[PDB]
Amino acid sequence: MASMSVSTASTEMSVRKIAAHMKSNPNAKVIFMVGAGISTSCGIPDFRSPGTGLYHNLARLKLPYPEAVFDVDFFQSDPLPFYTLAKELYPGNFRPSKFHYLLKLFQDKDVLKRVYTQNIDTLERQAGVKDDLIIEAHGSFAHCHCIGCGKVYPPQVFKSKLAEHPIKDFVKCDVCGELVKPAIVFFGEDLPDSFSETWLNDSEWLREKIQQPLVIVVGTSLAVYPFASLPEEIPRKVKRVLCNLETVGDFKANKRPTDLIVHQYSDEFAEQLVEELGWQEDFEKILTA
């Protein structure tokens, strides 16, 4: 969990402002929007990186290119690649990062309104964030369904097929015969209704608070839609914070006067915020359990 700054440049003052804004507006809550950046310190291998072994088994299995493992048409023509990545990335194989627990702390301090995650590792939930407060926009492995008729399947049936050596004979629907897959959203597929339904009620929640609101965007390159639309769709009068290594998306396209940009690692960012907030006490507790 140990972290360190990303440059010699200190970011404590910028982080200080965040705590300042929270102290001024005590009865306010925060809306997080995160991505893959917040889970890198957890050891989750990037399938797009030639450094991970996951990437190489994929390359060997003749996958034409990384993102094809999340392509409907490819999965149907050859599901082994996806099954192989599922085996390596299945929930429970990793542990929550310090930033993940920061979300938990916020839930305990009743200052967490919602956390929109585009990650599929489900580390927010695994770290204790309640279901009501989570929006897994790209789905998870917690559910499974037939890609043909939609019948529901217990997540276990898919998981039991992952330990066989080798992996073969995949889960076919016993109603229509098509392949059954985890409730992970693939390119070309739509997101679950709750993504827009929750964003809808959360968009009105924000416009009506203008106890000022605070939306913190962390660890995402904002390159996948429609997820990447939430930021520009933030009430122009609601303060936006960005914790990333590079300034990306709408923060680079149409910067807003009130924008606060913090170039820092998500775990080092968490270390600083919990300091400027003075919650080291409850934090340490959570971290040691």
Binding site: F186, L191, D193, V224
Partner: peptide, 8 residues
């Protein structure tokens, strides 16, 4: 609703 999971 946002369209389908994509780029751009």
């Amino acid at each position: 609703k946002g369209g389908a999971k994509r780029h751009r």
